[PDB]
Design a binder for this molecule. Structure first.
Ligand code: FES
Length: 117
């Protein structure tokens, strides 16, 4: 549970603001904003946004992820997890890390999984 500011403060694509501090990527996809835990779901390393290649490269066992977190290569077996994102009373985005949405169980499609912006 913390704040990552106003939706305006982001552009489409991948932001690495709170990567060092909160171990997250904040991604605005087409219509929407969502928050990716930078935690490889192979064993546990911290992968690396690679804008050139449109990819989060995990340096642990090569695992590759698309900009939406989908596991596309390497040993990683499932997409990178996502956190609940809500607008506060002050309009700023609260992230709640103790709720998580698993893209391969249709959890990205349920409330708090993203913000429409
Ligand atoms: S922990 Fe990321 S590839 Fe193994």
């Amino acid at each position: 549970r913390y704040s990552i500011g106003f939706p305006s403060q982001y552009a489409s694509g991948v932001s690495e603001k709170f990567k060092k501090q909160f171990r997250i990527w904040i991604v605005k996809e087409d219509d929407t904003l969502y928050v990716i835990e930078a935690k490889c779901t192979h064993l546990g390393c911290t992968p690396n946004w690679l804008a050139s290649e449109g990819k989060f490269k995990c340096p642990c066992h090569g695992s590759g992820f698309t900009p939406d977190g989908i596991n596309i290569e390497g040993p990683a077996p499932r997409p990178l997890e996502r956190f609940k994102v809500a607008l506060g009373d002050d309009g700023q985005i609260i992230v709640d890390e103790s709720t998580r949405y698993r893209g391969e169980r249709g959890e990205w499609d349920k409330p708090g999984a993203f913000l429409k912006v």
